[PDB]
Every structure is written in C-alpha cells, then in structure tokens.
C-alpha cells in the first residue's frame, strides 16, 4: 500500500499501479476511514530529497508507458514523444523544463561570485561544446579587462562579457533576444505575446531537437546491438539469453521478503499469462475483461 | 480530453468517403436518423440532437495492453523493422542449390568447392540467426534500462542540451 | 576567537552564538569576538578558536548531507 | 485465471518503482 | 526478456552518445 | 433488416484487415461515433490503431476522423498527437470549417505542437470574415486547451463576438476557452452572455458556461442556472461537479438547482467513488461548503477528506516560486506580528504551519484563543492574465472553504506584494490585509 505521502503525488498521474492504489485508498476512505495526519515537518534538505525520491516513483513507470518514435517519417512523432515527456514532468511535480533547469542553475551557484566558477560549477548541466566556447570568450574578455570578471551584472567587464556572449549565443544558433525578452517581459500583453510567439517556436525546435537526438541515439544503439547479435550462431544466442534470464531470475528469487522481488516475480507470471492468453486466441490478441 | 466538448450534429460529416461502407444522415429540424449500409450489414438508427453531447460524458480513455511495456514494445518494433531490413538482403542471396549437381563437383578445383560449400553453410547460419524472432524480446531489454535512467534525471525528464543551453543564456546574460 | 558569518550579526543571533559557543571551550572562558563576513557560507557561522575550528556552517552541512546520502544509496 | 482486468493489464510491468521505493524507505528514516 | 533493475539518477545533461554504425550490411553484401 | 451488432461485427471485421487507407478508417470512425458504442472498447481501439498506421490523408478524411475522435469522447494521446503532422502538412488546404474542427479536436487532447497553433492562429487572424463565430470559438478552444496562452486571436475573436449574434454552444465554448485562458474580460463576457436567452438544447453548454462564469467569478444569469436545473439527469458527474462548482463560485442561490445537480453526483459516488478524480471531489466539497445543501452521510465527510487530499497534492507539487512566495509572505507577516531579528522570524515562521482539522497542512496559520487567521498567497497562475490582474475563482473558493473551518483568510495577491521594495512595506501590506478581515489581530 501507500504511506500517505506517496499518495499525494499519484492523484494527477495516470499510470496503472498508482491509479489502482489511489482507487483502493479512496475505497478505504469511503468505507469508513479517517485521513491520516499530513506531516508538518521534514526540514528543507529532507523535503527536497523526498521530492527527488518520490517524483522518481511516478516518473519511472511513466517512461515505460511512453513509446519511442523509432524511425518514423515526419518530425511530428518526435513532437508526440516530447509532449508525452512534458506531460510526465507536469504530473511528476516538475515545472516547465526551461524554468526547472533555470532553478537548478540558481541552486548550483548561489555561492559563486566570479564568472569562471559559475562556468565551473555548472559544467555538468550545460553542454561542453558550449562550455568550451564560453570559457574561451571569457578568457578573451579576461585578456581585455586583465582582472577576474565579476558575476554581479553592473560591472562594465561583465557588460562587455554579456555583449560578447550574446554573439556567442547567436553563434550557437539560438536567438538570445527572444529568450531574454521572454523572461524580462514587456509593458503590454500584446508585445509580450509577440515575444512568446517566437520563444515558444524556438522552444519547440529545442525540445524536438534533443528528443530527436535521443531517439537517434536509441536507434543507433539498437542497430549496434542487433549487428553485434546477428553475427552469432543461434545456439550461442539461445544459451546466452537463457543463462542471462536465469541469472537475473536468481537475483530476484534470492531476495526473500523484498517488495521489488515479489513485484518482479508477479510481473514474470503476468508475462507468462500474456503468452498463454495470446496462445489461446491469437486472432484478436489478449483476453481483456470488459 | 477535456470534460466539456462542443461537437455533434453541427458541422457534422454528411456522407461516406469510402466504397467499403456507406452512410447518409437525416439533417432535419430537431432529430436525426443515420442510415449506414455496409455490404451484408444494414443499420438505420434514430438519434436526438442532444444525444451526441451525452456521448462524450463518459470518456473511453483507450490504453495499451503490452507484454512488457509500451516502451519495450516500441524498441521490439524497431528491432523487428531492422530484422526486416536485414532479411531483405538475405532474400537477394543467389540460389546455390542449383550448383550442387555432380557436374559442378568434378569440374571444380577442390578448394573452390570447399569454399563454396562453406559459403552455403555460412548462409544457412546467417538465415537461421536472422530469423530468431524470439530473441528480440531479450535484445530490447538491453536498450531499455540506460534509456530509463537517462529519463530519470534530477532536473527534468524531457531535458536536453538545447533547452539547457537556452536557459544558460538566460541565466548568464541577465544581471547575475 | 574569530567568527565568520554570511550576514552581519543581529543582537539575538549574537547572544545565541555566544551561548552556543561557550560549550566549545573547556572552562568559563570569556570568549572574545572578531566578526567577519564571507558569503561562501550559506548562512550560519564558523567559529575559529585559532587552534581549532568548529564548522557550524550551512554549506558544510549540505555537503556532508550529500556525502551521507551518497554513502547510503550505494549501500541499500 | 484468464481475462483478468484492464487496469491490472495496463501496468508497465518491468519498470522499477519499487527498488526506488525500497531505497526511499530505507534512506529517509536513516537520514532524519 | 527481463532487465536488471537500477535505481540511480543522472545529474548531467549531456548528448546521448550516438554510437557507431556497424558494418553488417557491407559485410553481408561482401 | 435493421440491427446494430451485425454492423458492429462487420466494422470489427473491416478494420481488422491489414491494408486500410485513410478514407476507410475515417468513415469507420464516423460510423462508430454515429451509433454510440462506448461499451465497446476493442473496436474503437482497432479503429484508432488503423488511424495511426495510415499514411495518406485528404482534408475531409482527417477532418471527419478528428471529429469522430473528439465527439466520441475517446482519449488516446499518442495516435491523436501523431495526427498533428497530417494536420500541419494539410493546414493551408483545409477548409475553414475543417481547419476549425481539426484544430479544436487537436486542442481537446492537449497536443503540444506549437507550430500547428502558431500557423492556425495566423491563418485564422489573417482572414477572419470567412469564419463564422462557431469556427473561431472552436479555434479559440483548441488554442486555449492546446497549451498556448495566445491573446491575439482572443482579442480578434472578442471583436467578432461583440459584433454579431452567436449561438449558445459557440458562446459556451468561447467562455470555456476564456476560463482556461484566464482573462475575465467583462466587456467580452457581457457580449457573450446575451445569447443564453432562448434556452439551450443541451446541458453541456450550460454546464460549461456556468463553470466558466464561476472560474472567472463574475455572477450567474438565472436562466443558465434554470437551463441547468431543467433536466438535470443528463450531465456526466464529471461535468456536473464542475458545473456546480461554477455555480458556487459565482454565488448561486438556486438551491433547487444544486439539489438537482447533486441528484446525479451522489448516486455516482454511491455506486463507485473511485471513478472520479480527486480534483473533482475537491470541487464538490467547495460547492457543498458554499451552497450548504444536504449531502448523504457517506459522501460529505468523504469529500471533506478529499479536499484535504487535493489541497496537500497541490501544495506538494508547488511551483517553487510559490514556495519562495509563501516564505516571503510568512517572513513579512512574522515581521508584522513582531520579530525584528532573524532567529525570531525563523521561530515565528516555524510556528505558522499548524494543520487544519480536515487533514491539510496550512502554510500560514495564526492563532490567538478562539480566532484563527490564515494568509493566502496568489502567485501568478491563479491570477488573471489580463490588465486588471485580478485573482481567479479558485482563490475565493479556497477562502470560502477555509472560512468554514474557523479561519479568516486575508488573500494576498502577488502582483501587489512583489512590487513593494522593502520588507517593512510588505509587513504593512499584510497588516492592512489581516486587520481588514479580522480586526482582533
């Protein structure tokens, strides 16, 4: 069952083993139960840690209900996949990914004062192809000022660094003007909407670009796995797959009392049930009660 | 889908588009009788004007029924399509059973015949291993968990290089 | 001593820091002060008795918390 | 037996969700 | 068909490492 | 000679064949939605599978297919979002009625295809006079629920809605789109509520109009309420709860209408409580607190717990600027009640988080004796997107349901709060907020 804090995340999500648990919880509440006390505790590190480890339990089955658009004609199945992942991030408690990684940027370098360590401490979160170019243009403005560039904003060296890194950003191909005018806003709602109708266009191009990069990586990895697999004779393939399946089955059956092991074994029995149900009536598929 | 929809018996489709099934409706004042004719089947119903808005009160919410996962089914679909692409070029192999007669055996250099019979055994090996379709269910499970860990990011599942680059421009070019 | 805080001291947190600091000296020593400002701490204080240092910081707290939460998830 | 249910069949089967639940159950009382 | 279960996070946002194209089509045409 | 399961078996044998082009599956979906086959899921599943697998598309075929997916009430996001490519590639060749039905049916499922919505906005705003206001109402609904906060076609639709006479369904769809957009334009809602005078042939339009007038929180109309109460046995429970919520947020006095709306909801939760979503049960508890009508003994305390569940759900998935916002408002109201140093403002923000007796955890709760005072923060998403920048109806809903527990909610909108340059002005603002609604504090 659930422990009164996992069930507060599973309300808006639509994955099956969360929806059936929420439905059994409401079956408990309608049939004469009181709601347990929500904890007014757990100081901020434990709060964001349990957010990190509780949104994981609602995102990780959400990826498996999302089918990859591997090798399809048109960029619109990539838009389907990225929209599904956006909806999964929305139902997982994450924000828009732009403002989410902006929040991570602010969280990472709250204690950085110069601009070289703001490019050092956010090395894991930005592209190294872009981090190398930003470090080299910062070494250029460092050769200009002959002083460490300060990460304050009102410094003239940082102003020249901003006017050079905007050219670096257009050199990467992404327009910094529509993005800065989006997050800086305008007076009237009409010239804010005219900026948003460019920023959302770039935003769609950006998320479909990295989603298409992801499905191209899975396409090439599946092609490499198949081409390393087709070079084997069939008895070696059957022995390797049966031995790997038996070993990872022994790894589950060894864990006695573990909940994940019991769920693993029940899903194995459900897979065998699916094989039996397609074996009984293969004209229509599995037997589903309706 | 939203809970309130706004469609039905207004800008509705008026007729058929295929030769497999026929349909024509009755656009009367208050009511509507459909007449759908499909070969050996015949159906003519009488529906009301508000009988189409009560249709979308309950939602269907169609869902997949997958053996392992919908993601695993998509990866197994791509492995089946790649096995189709390899099977299309094991289908253009030249027929070598026509050169098994003994009038090709004894006119041949012996090592060339050794090479030819070993090439035939190699083709039978390649064809037995490209049509092992039971093994795609365990080939797909080696692509799954690294992908599922990549989508289990600490910032956002749909995150990528370009959106992080754009937000780094937004973080850097503003006043700290 | 020599305290270092992220912010300048308010007259409640000054008394609180003096009361929480006297359990780190092994007498009724009239511990002196030398307020210093470093924003590399994310709040809190780091007392430096010039022979030993007690790190009561927030940045050290979150880094030790990250090390402990990394040492548990590799064990569980 | 056969023809079990619909939401019992909609479950993404070999997703983790429980190993994460195991580590989140044995981590948070050990860190509070 | 069953995969090993992992519970770990990726904090890095990198390119997804598009792997090498293997030479099976050219070897089979050869 | 006339029989429906024979033709259902025939369509089940028609779609299950492997080679089916777009016209067969489009007409099959139209024939399926013309016979109301909601108890059959496998046939709708096969027709969506073969709708997804198709390659060629005509304008009439894709329009009829999207019309049948929309009107049939089927949600399957993957196949309908892969249809958006055939919609984009065929968008300039679509008829205005057909472009209307395509973009409305795609916006119904919430597809995040921004190029589709930008191009459809430019097409519908460049040539406006060809579109009857039903068509731009459908386009406004599709661009509103499709993840776009576009205001240009909203103004261009409000002009045509203020110029000509429109139908009831078009006005209801338009107000639903404005309620999800969050505009609360009085000048347009007055021009659009004048069409609800002939009586509406369906109760879904009156239900959506009531929910829109509740979520933008203007008032009722007393004939939309009477058109709801007239045959209140037809609406879905997930439609009826949002209709009652939209009546309660606009302060509906027709308690007979609330009894007629509960007369379909209480058997629905009496049969199976698990079918409805918990946000809808929270809306039911809001409507039950504002209207005060009687509910069954098993459902009243049930939605009382369900409002706490949905409130803790909405607080746990907080936007993390609202987290900083309630931290700022709590620090300001701890300065205002008196804590001039950092450890005492920490000790005061630590003691403002008492739990409400229904199970929720309140962010700012102040207690002295008998009176409890809550402070409510409205960051930006619960604000209107227009130039008055007023709070949405969920704010007044949360205030009226917290006042039923013993709290005096001082709503602090954040368009006013973050415009203050210091902490002392924020303390004076929250003092002006709290002293107005509960002068004992």
From TrEMBL, chain B:
This is Mitochondrial ATP synthase associated protein ASA7. It comes from Polytomella sp. Pringsheim 198.80.
From TrEMBL, chain C:
It is found in: Membrane. It comes from the Eukaryota. Belongs to the ATPase delta chain family. This is Mitochondrial ATP synthase subunit OSCP. It comes from Polytomella sp. Pringsheim 198.80. The lineage of its organism: Eukaryota, Viridiplantae, Chlorophyta, core chlorophytes, Chlorophyceae. The chain holds residues 154 to 229 of 229 of the full protein.
TrEMBL record, chain D:
Coiled coil: none annotated. It comes from the Eukaryota. It is found in: Mitochondrion inner membrane. Mitochondrial membrane ATP synthase (F(1)F(0) ATP synthase or Complex V) produces ATP from ADP in the presence of a proton gradient across the membrane which is generated by electron transport complexes of the respiratory chain. F-type ATPases consist of two structural domains, F(1) - containing the extramembraneous catalytic core, and F(0) - containing the membrane proton channel, linked together by a central stalk and a peripheral stalk. During catalysis, ATP synthesis in the catalytic domain of F(1) is coupled via a rotary mechanism of the central stalk subunits to proton translocation. Belongs to the ATPase alpha/beta chains family. This is ATP synthase subunit alpha. It comes from Polytomella sp. Pringsheim 198.80. The gene is atp1. The chain holds residues 40 to 71 of 562 of the full protein.
UniProtKB/TrEMBL annotation, chain E:
It comes from the Eukaryota. It comes from Polytomella sp. Pringsheim 198.80. This is ATP synthase associated protein ASA1. The lineage of its organism: Eukaryota, Viridiplantae, Chlorophyta, core chlorophytes, Chlorophyceae. The chain holds residues 23 to 52 of 618 of the full protein.
């Amino acid at each position: 069952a659930v422990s009164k804090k996992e069930v507060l995340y599973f309300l808006s999500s639509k994955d099956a083993e969360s929806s059936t648990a929420v439905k059994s919880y409401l079956k408990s509440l309608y049939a004469g139960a009181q709601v347990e006390a929500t904890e007014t505790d757990a100081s901020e590190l434990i709060a964001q840690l349990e957010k990190k480890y509780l949104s994981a339990q609602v995102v990780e089955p959400g990826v498996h209900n999302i089918a990859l658009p591997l090798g399809e004609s048109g960029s619109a199945p990539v838009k389907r996949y990225a929209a599904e992942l956006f909806n999964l991030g929305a139902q997982a408690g994450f924000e828009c990914p732009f403002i989410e990684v902006s929040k991570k940027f602010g969280q990472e370098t709250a204690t950085s004062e110069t601009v070289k360590d703001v490019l050092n401490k956010t090395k894991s979160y930005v592209s190294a192809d872009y981090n190398a170019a930003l470090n080299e243009v910062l070494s250029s403005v460092e050769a200009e000022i002959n002083g460490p560039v300060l990460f304050d904003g009102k410094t003239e060296g940082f102003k020249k660094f901003a006017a050079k890194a905007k050219a670096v950003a257009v050199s990467r191909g992404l327009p910094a003007d529509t993005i800065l005018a989006y997050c800086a806003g305008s007076a009237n709602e009409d010239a804010a909407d005219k900026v948003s109708k460019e920023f959302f266009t770039w935003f769609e191009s950006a998320y479909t670009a990295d989603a298409a990069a992801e499905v191209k990586a899975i396409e090439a990895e599946a092609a490499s796995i198949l081409d390393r697999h087709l070079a084997k004779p069939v008895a070696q393939i059957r022995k390797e797959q049966a031995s790997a399946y038996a070993s990872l089955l022994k790894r589950a059956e060894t864990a006695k009392g573990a909940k994940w092991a019991e769920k693993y074994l029940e899903d194995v029995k459900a897979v065998q049930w699916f094989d039996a149900s397609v074996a009984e009536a293969p004209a229509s598929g599995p037997k589903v009660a309706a | 889908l939203t809970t309130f929809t706004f469609s039905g018996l207004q800008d509705a489709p008026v007729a058929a588009l295929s030769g497999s099934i026929k349909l024509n409706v009755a656009a009367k004042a208050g009511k509507a009788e459909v007449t759908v004719a499909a070969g050996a089947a015949k159906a003519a119903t009488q529906v009301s004007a508000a009988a189409l808005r009560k249709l979308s009160g309950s939602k269907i919410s169609l869902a997949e029924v997958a053996r392992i996962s919908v993601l695993h089914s998509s990866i197994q679909n791509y492995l089946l399509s790649l096995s189709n692409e390899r099977y299309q070029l094991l289908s253009q192999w030249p027929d070598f059973t026509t050169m098994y007669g003994k009038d090709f055996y004894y006119r041949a250099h012996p090592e060339d015949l050794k090479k030819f019979y070993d090439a035939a055994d190699e083709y039978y090996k390649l064809y037995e291993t490209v049509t092992e379709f039971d093994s795609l269910s365990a080939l797909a499970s080696q692509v799954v968990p690294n992908y599922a860990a990549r989508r289990r990011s600490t910032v956002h599942p749909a995150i990528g290089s370009t959106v992080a680059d754009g937000a780094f421009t937004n973080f850097l070019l503003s006043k700290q | 001593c020599t305290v270092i805080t992220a912010e300048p001291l308010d007259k409640l947190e000054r008394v609180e820091l003096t009361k929480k600091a006297e359990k780190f000296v092994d007498a009724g020593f009239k511990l002196v002060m030398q307020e210093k400002i470093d924003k590399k701490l994310l709040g809190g204080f780091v007392i430096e008795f010039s022979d030993r240092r007690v790190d009561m910081s927030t940045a050290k707290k979150v880094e030790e918390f990250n090390n402990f939460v990394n040492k548990l998830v590799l064990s569980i | 037996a056969d023809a079990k249910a619909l939401d019992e069949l909609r479950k993404p089967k070999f997703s983790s969700k429980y190993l994460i639940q195991h580590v989140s159950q044995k981590l948070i009382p050990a860190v509070k | 068909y069953l995969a090993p279960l992992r519970s770990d996070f990726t904090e890095e946002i990198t390119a997804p490492k598009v792997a090498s194209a293997s030479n099976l089509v050219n070897e089979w045409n050869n | 000679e006339n029989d429906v399961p024979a033709i259902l078996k025939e369509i089940d044998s028609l779609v299950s064949r492997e080679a089916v082009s777009a016209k067969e599956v489009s007409d099959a979906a139209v024939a399926l939605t013309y016979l109301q086959v909601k108890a059959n899921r496998r046939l709708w599943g096969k027709v969506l599978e073969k709708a997804g697998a198709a390659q060629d598309y005509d304008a009439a075929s894709l329009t009829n297919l999207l019309w049948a997916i929309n009107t049939g009430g089927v949600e399957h996001f993957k196949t309908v979002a892969e249809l958006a490519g055939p919609a984009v590639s065929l968008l300039p060749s679509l008829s205005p009625v057909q472009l209307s039905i395509v973009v409305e049916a795609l916006g119904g499922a919430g597809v995040k295809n921004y190029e589709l919505y930008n191009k459809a906005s430019a097409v519908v705003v460049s040539k406006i006079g060809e579109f009857k206001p039903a068509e731009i109402a459908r386009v406004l609904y599709g661009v509103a629920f499709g993840g776009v906060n576009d205001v240009a076609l909203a103004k261009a639709a409000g002009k045509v809605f203020a110029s000509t006479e429109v139908d009831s369904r078009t006005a209801a769809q338009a107000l639903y789109a404005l309620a999800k957009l969050g505009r609360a334009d009085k000048a347009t809602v007055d021009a659009l509520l004048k069409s609800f005078k002939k009586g509406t042939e369906s109760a879904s339009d009156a239900a959506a109009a009531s929910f829109a007038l509740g979520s933008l929180s203007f008032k009722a109309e007393k004939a939309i309420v009477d058109a709801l109460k007239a045959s209140a046995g037809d609406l879905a429970p997930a439609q009826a709860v949002e209709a009652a919520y939209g009546l309660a947020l606009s302060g509906a006095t027709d308690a007979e209408a609330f009894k007629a709306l509960f007369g379909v909801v209480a058997p629905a939760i009496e049969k199976a409580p698990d079918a409805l979503e918990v946000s809808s049960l929270a809306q039911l508890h809001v409507a039950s607190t504002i209207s005060g009508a009687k509910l069954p003994a098993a459902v009243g305390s049930f939605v009382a717990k369900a409002f706490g569940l949905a409130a803790d759900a909405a607080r746990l998935k907080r936007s993390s600027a609202e987290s900083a916002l309630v931290a700022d408002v709590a620090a300001a109201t701890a300065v205002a009640f008196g804590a001039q140093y950092r450890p005492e403002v920490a000790s005061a923000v630590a003691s403002y988080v008492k739990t409400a007796p229904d199970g929720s955890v309140l962010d700012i709760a102040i207690t002295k004796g008998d009176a409890k005072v809550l402070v409510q923060a409205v960051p930006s998403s619960l604000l209107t997107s227009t130039t008055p920048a007023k709070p949405l109806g969920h704010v007044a809903a949360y205030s009226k349901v917290r006042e039923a527990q013993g709290y005096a909610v001082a709503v602090v909108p954040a368009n006013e709060f973050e415009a203050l340059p210091d902490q002392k002005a924020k303390a004076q603002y929250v003092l002006a907020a709290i002293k107005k609604v509960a002068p004992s504090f």
